[PDB]
Write a protein that binds this ligand. Structure first.
Ligand code: HEM
Ligand code: HEM
Ligand SMILES: O=C1N[C@@H](Cc2c[nH]c3ccccc23)C(=O)N[C@H]1Cc1c[nH]c2ccccc12
Ligand SMILES: Nc1ncnc2[nH]cnc12
Ligand SMILES: Nc1ncnc2[nH]cnc12
Lengths: 389, 381
C-alpha cells in the first residue's frame, strides 16, 4: 500500500505524514493523483542533493509519456520557461524586470498599493477577507507593473490562475482554452496602438525591432505573471495566518521594523503554500540516500519536509525570527532556484510591514481549524482568509 | 457509533448515506457538528409530517440550552409588528413589475461581460453572485455598487460552526449598520423595503427595520445564488435540458420546479425542537429534542417520485419540499422561481455550448457552510 501523494490540503500545520516520511523513508515510493509512481524526497540533505544534481531534469517532466504528478495545464515548452528565455537573448529583458533594484520607485509604489487596499478594508470595517481584499489585488498589481499593463482587469487575470494552476489526474478541456485566452490578452497589450512603453512588454516592444515571435513574447509575459502572482498571493496568505495566530510576531515587527527581512526569511522557511513537490525526471540511475532511482523515474521534492528537518533547523515547528542561520529551500535550490527571490521578499516585506501598522489587532475571525483549504491546486491556500481588527 | 451529520458537502450527486438512512432508518439518531444529538428525518412522509405539524417549532431552535446542529450567527430574535404588509408586498414579484425585464437586463449584462472575455469564466462570481445580489439590492431599494462586500458578509453569516466565533457578531453589526444608514439616508429612500419602511415609521425601531432588511437580503441572496449554481451544473452536465429550454422556452417554470426538487444547495437540515412527546414512524421523539429535516432525503424518495435520481421536466406531479412546507414554507418562493427562470433562460440563449471546464468530480465543494456550493464554477461555451 504506497502512501498517497499529494499530502493534506490543510496549510496551517505540517502534515503528520511529512514528519513520518522524513523519519522512516526520506525517499519513499508513492502513488501520485495520476496513478503514476514517484520518489518523494522529504529530508533536507536529500532534497538539496536532488535540486543540486543536474541528472534530475525539470525540463523533462513535460515530455510525453513520462510519469506525472498531475496533468500538464500549459504547453510543454513553458515548463522550461527559464531555459527558453535564456536561449533567445531575452534573459536581459527578463532579469531587468525581476530585479527590484532596476525599478527605483517599486518600493514606494508597492507600499502605496498595500496602504490603499488595507485603507479600503478599514473604511468598511471588520471582518474582511485578506485574500480577495488584500493578497490577490496586491499580487496582481505588482505583476501588472512588472509586465507594464494596467490593473483594470486583475480580477480576470487572477481568475486565469484559478484554472491554469489546477492539479488534475488527467488533462481537462479548458486548461488549453484558458492558456490561449490570456495569451491573447498579452498579445493584444503588446501590439496596442499606443505601443507599450514601461515593463517587460515595454522591453519586448523595444526588443523585436532589433537584429522571437509575438507568441513567445506573450508566452514569457503570461508565464511570469501567473507564476509570480500565484506564488506571492499564496505565500502572503500563509504569512498573514502566522501573524494572526502568533500576534507576538506582529508586535516584534511594529517594535523593530528592520527585522522584517529576517522575519520574511523565516516565514518563507515555515510557509506551506507549495501544495505539491518540485518535480524532476531522472536522466540516469542515481543512488539517492538508500534508494536506487532508475533513469526515466519521477522524483518529487517535499519542500516542507526539508524546511522542517530538525537535522538542519532547531525547533523547526516553531517560528523564530532570531535564527543565526536559515538555509531554507522555500525558493528551491541549484539551477532552478527562483530567479525572482529578491522580488518575492520585497513583495512580502512591504505587504507585511503595512499590515501590522494598519491592523495592529489582526486575528482570524474564527478558529484556524475551520478555514476552507483549496483542493486540487498547486498552492495550499485558504479560499477565504476572514480576519477581525 | 452514530452516523455523522451533516453529510457530504458534495452537491452534484445525492449522498449514498442519505439513501441508506432513508431506506433503513428514516428517523435516525445523529451527532451534529456541535456534538449534540438530533433526529434526522429523511423520508418524504415523515419529512412532510414534521413540517406540517406545529408540535415541532423553528422559533425555539434559537432558544438557549436546546440542542443545536451548529452555533447561532445572528441574534436570537431573528430565527407581530404590522410589517407583514411591507415585507409580503416586497416578496411579491408582482409589486416590482419591471423586475422581470430588469433581472433579464442584469443576466444579459453579466453574461455579455463573460462572452467578451471569452471562456473559461467562473459562473459563481461572474453570474450567480452579482445577479443574486442585484435582485436583493433592488428588493431593498439600495444601489448594487457594494455587492462584493454584501456577499462577503454572507460568506461569514452562513458559516456552520461547532461553537460560536467572534466575527459572527462583528459581521452581523457591520451590515446592520450598513442597512441602518441606507434607511436614514438624507434623501430618504423611496422604492424597496427601505422606501416602504421609511413611509411606515411616519405612520418598531431602526434596529428592527435594518434587521428584517438584512436577514431578508441574507437568506435570499445565499439561497438564490446557491440554487442557481446547482441548476447551472444540471444544465452543463445534461445539455439536453438546455436544448429543451431553447426549443420550448415556456417549459422553464416546470423545468425550474424539477431543478428545485433535484438541487442539493441546502447543506444542513430544516431544524425543529419537539414541543412535546411525538411518535414519528417507529421513533419516540421526547419534548425538547432536536429534529432535522433532510430535504434531499424527501425530494429523492421513490415512494413519491419515480426515478428520483433522474431530472424529468415532464413529471405529471412534483410536490417537492425544496421550499419546505407547513407554516414556514418559503414566503419568497415565486421570487425564487422568477430569479432562476430568467437567469437560466438568459444562460441557455447566450451560452448554448455551455459545459464544465473540467470533470464535475474535481469541483471544490465549500465546507462548513449552510449551503452546498462549488467555491468556483468554471465553464466553457
Ligand atoms: C514568495 C514567492 C515565491 C516563492 C515561494 C517561489 C518559489 C519558487 C520555487 C521553489 C521555484 C523552483 C521550482 C523548481 O525547482 O522546480 C521557483 C522557480 C521559479 N519562480 Fe519562483 N517563487 C516565488 C515568486 C516568484 C515570482 C514573483 C516570479 C516571477 C514573477 C517567480 C517565477 C519563477 C520562475 C520563472 C521559476 C522557474 C525557474 C527555473 O525553472 O529555472 N517566482 N519559484
Ligand atoms: C430558490 C431559493 C430559495 C430556496 C431553495 C429557499 C428555501 C427555503 C426553505 C426550505 C425555507 C424553509 C425554512 C424551514 O422550514 O426551516 C425557506 C424559508 C425562508 N426563506 Fe426561502 N428559499 C429560497 C429563496 C428565498 C428568497 C428569495 C427569500 C427572500 C428574500 C427567502 C427568505 C426566506 C425566509 C424569510 C424564510 C423563513 C420563513 C419562516 O421562517 O416562516 N428565501 N426558504
Ligand atoms: O515559468 C515556469 N516555470 C516552471 C516552474 C515554476 C515556476 N513558478 C511556478 C509556480 C507554480 C508551479 C510551477 C512553477 C514551470 O513548470 N512552469 C512555469 C510557471 C507556470 C505558469 N503557468 C503554469 C501553470 C501550471 C504550472 C506551472 C505554470
Ligand atoms: N512546482 C511548484 N509547485 C509549487 N510551487 C512552485 N513554485 C515554483 N514551482 C512550484
Ligand atoms: N435552514 C436552512 N438551510 C438552508 N437553506 C435555507 N433557506 C432557508 N432556510 C434554510
Amino acid at each position: 500500500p504506497l502512501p498517497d501523494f499529494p499530502l493534506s490540503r490543510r496549510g496551517d500545520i505540517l502534515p503528520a505524514e511529512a514528519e513520518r516520511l522524513r523519519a522512516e523513508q526520506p525517499v519513499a515510493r508513492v502513488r501520485t493523483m495520476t496513478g503514476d509512481e514517484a520518489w518523494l524526497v522529504s529530508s533536507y540533505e536529500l532534497a538539496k542533493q536532488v535540486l543540486e544534481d543536474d541528472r534530475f531534469s525539470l525540463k523533462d517532466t513535460a515530455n510525453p509519456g513520462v510519469p506525472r504528478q498531475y496533468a500538464l495545464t500549459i504547453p510543454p515548452e513553458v515548463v522550461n520557461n527559464m531555459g527558453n528565455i535564456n536561449s533567445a537573448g531575452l534573459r536581459n529583458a527578463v532579469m531587468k524586470t525581476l530585479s527590484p533594484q532596476a525599478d527605483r520607485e517599486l518600493g514606494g509604489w508597492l507600499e502605496a498599493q498595500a496602504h490603499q487596499l488595507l485603507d479600503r478594508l478599514i473604511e468598511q470595517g471588520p471582518p474582511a477577507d485578506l485574500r480577495d481584499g488584500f493578497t490577490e489585488p496586491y499580487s496582481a498589481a505588482l505583476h501588472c507593473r512588472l509586465l507594464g499593463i494596467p490593473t483594470d482587469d486583475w480580477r480576470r487575470l487572477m481568475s486565469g490562475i484559478d484554472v491554469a494552476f489546477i492539479t488534475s489526474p488527467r488533462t481537462f478541456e479548458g486548461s488549453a482554452v484558458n492558456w490561449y485566452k490570456d495569451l491573447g490578452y498579452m498579445v493584444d497589450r503588446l501590439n496596442a496602438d499606443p505601443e507599450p512603453t514601461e515593463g517587460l512588454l515595454g522591453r519586448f516592444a523595444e526588443l523585436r525591432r532589433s537584429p522571437v515571435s509575438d507568441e513567445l513574447l506573450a508566452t514569457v509575459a503570461l508565464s511570469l505573471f501567473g507564476a509570480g502572482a500565484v506564488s506571492t498571493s499564496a505565500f502572503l496568505q500563509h504569512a498573514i495566518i502566522a501573524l494572526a495566530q502568533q500576534p507576538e510576531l506582529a508586535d516584534r515587527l511594529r517594535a523593530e521594523p528592520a527585522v522584517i527581512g529576517r522575519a520574511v526569511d523565516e516565514l518563507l522557511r515555515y510557509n506551506l503554500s507549495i501544495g505539491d513537490a518540485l518535480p524532476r525526471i531522472a536522466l540516469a540511475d542515481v543512488r539517492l540516500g538508500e534508494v536506487e532511482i532508475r533513469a526515466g523515474e519521477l522524483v518529487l521534492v517535499l519542500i516542507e519536509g526539508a524546511n522542517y528537518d530538525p537535522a538542519v533547523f532547531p525547533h523547526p515547528e516553531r517560528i523564530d525570527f532570531d535564527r543565526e542561520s536559515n538555509p531554507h529551500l522555500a525558493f528551491g535550490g541549484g539551477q532552478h532556484f527562483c530567479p525572482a527571490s529578491a522580488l518575492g521578499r520585497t513583495h512580502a516585506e512591504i505587504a507585511l510591514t503595512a499590515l501590522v501598522e494598519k491592523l495592529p489587532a489582526l486575528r482570524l475571525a474564527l478558529p484556524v481549524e475551520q478555514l476552507a483549504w483549496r483542493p486540487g491546486f498547486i498552492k495550499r491556500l485558504p479560499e477565504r482568509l476572514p480576519v477581525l481588527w
